[PDB]
Amino acid sequence: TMVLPGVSYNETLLTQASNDDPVTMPLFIGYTPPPVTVMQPVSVGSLT
Protein backbone atom coordinates (compact mmCIF):
# COMPACT_ATOMS: atom_id res chain seq x y z
CA THR A 1 0.00 0.00 0.00
CA MET A 2 3.09 2.16 0.41
CA VAL A 3 5.23 4.40 -1.71
CA LEU A 4 8.74 5.87 -2.03
CA PRO A 5 9.54 9.61 -2.68
CA GLY A 6 9.43 9.22 -6.44
CA VAL A 7 12.32 11.53 -7.32
CA SER A 8 10.80 11.93 -10.79
CA TYR A 9 13.62 12.59 -13.23
CA ASN A 10 13.02 14.20 -16.62
CA GLU A 11 14.78 16.62 -18.98
CA THR A 12 14.31 18.97 -21.96
CA LEU A 13 15.78 19.66 -25.37
CA LEU A 14 17.35 22.02 -27.87
CA THR A 15 18.03 22.11 -31.63
CA GLN A 16 16.27 24.22 -34.18
CA ALA A 17 19.46 23.36 -36.10
CA SER A 18 17.91 22.53 -39.55
CA ASN A 19 19.45 24.89 -42.09
CA ASP A 20 20.18 23.15 -45.40
CA ASP A 21 18.69 24.98 -48.42
CA PRO A 22 19.79 22.56 -51.16
CA VAL A 23 17.93 24.63 -53.72
CA THR A 24 21.21 26.28 -54.69
CA MET A 25 22.63 22.85 -55.44
CA PRO A 26 23.03 22.07 -59.15
CA LEU A 27 22.56 18.68 -60.74
CA PHE A 28 24.59 17.57 -63.74
CA ILE A 29 22.25 15.23 -65.53
CA GLY A 30 24.39 13.96 -68.38
CA TYR A 31 25.23 10.49 -69.60
CA THR A 32 28.22 8.60 -68.27
CA PRO A 33 31.56 9.67 -69.75
CA PRO A 34 33.00 6.33 -70.91
CA PRO A 35 30.30 1.94 -62.94
CA VAL A 36 27.63 4.35 -61.69
CA THR A 37 23.87 3.94 -61.69
CA VAL A 38 21.91 5.18 -64.68
CA MET A 39 19.57 6.96 -62.36
CA GLN A 40 20.98 8.38 -59.14
CA PRO A 41 22.28 11.89 -58.41
CA VAL A 42 25.89 11.73 -57.26
CA SER A 43 27.54 14.42 -55.14
CA VAL A 44 30.79 15.97 -56.34
CA GLY A 45 33.61 17.06 -54.09
CA SER A 46 35.81 18.39 -56.87
CA LEU A 47 36.88 17.92 -60.45
CA THR A 48 39.94 16.33 -58.95
Binding site: V3, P5, T12, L14
Partner: protein, 41 residues
Protein backbone atom coordinates in the same frame (compact mmCIF):
# COMPACT_ATOMS: atom_id res chain seq x y z
CA UNK B 1 -20.24 33.76 21.83
CA UNK B 2 -23.83 34.41 22.74
CA UNK B 3 -25.36 32.87 19.63
CA UNK B 4 -22.00 32.13 18.08
CA UNK B 5 -21.92 28.94 20.12
CA UNK B 6 -24.71 29.13 22.64
CA UNK B 7 -28.21 30.39 23.34
CA UNK B 8 -30.29 31.24 26.39
CA UNK B 9 -31.68 27.71 26.33
CA UNK B 10 -28.13 26.50 26.76
CA UNK B 11 -27.59 29.33 29.21
CA UNK B 12 -30.49 27.88 31.13
CA UNK B 13 -29.01 24.55 30.31
CA UNK B 14 -25.68 25.92 31.51
CA UNK B 15 -23.75 24.79 28.46
CA UNK B 16 -20.44 26.47 27.80
CA UNK B 17 -19.55 25.98 24.17
CA UNK B 18 -16.63 26.98 21.92
CA UNK B 19 -15.67 26.41 18.28
CA UNK B 20 -12.05 25.43 17.67
CA UNK B 21 -10.39 25.99 14.29
CA UNK B 22 -7.02 24.89 12.90
CA UNK B 23 -5.36 24.90 9.47
CA UNK B 24 -3.07 22.04 8.58
CA UNK B 25 0.56 21.41 7.67
CA UNK B 26 1.70 18.55 5.41
CA UNK B 27 4.89 16.49 5.09
CA UNK B 28 6.76 16.56 1.78
CA UNK B 29 6.69 12.93 0.78
CA UNK B 30 7.55 12.75 -2.90
CA UNK B 31 9.91 14.24 -5.38
CA UNK B 32 8.30 15.41 -8.62
CA UNK B 33 11.35 16.54 -10.55
CA UNK B 34 11.13 18.24 -13.90
CA UNK B 35 14.11 19.30 -15.97
CA UNK B 36 14.59 22.08 -18.49
CA UNK B 37 17.77 22.52 -20.53
CA UNK B 38 16.93 26.09 -21.64
CA UNK B 39 19.05 26.24 -24.82
CA UNK B 40 20.88 29.49 -24.05
CA UNK B 41 21.92 29.94 -27.68
Amino acid sequence: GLDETMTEDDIRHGKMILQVRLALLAPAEFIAISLTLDLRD
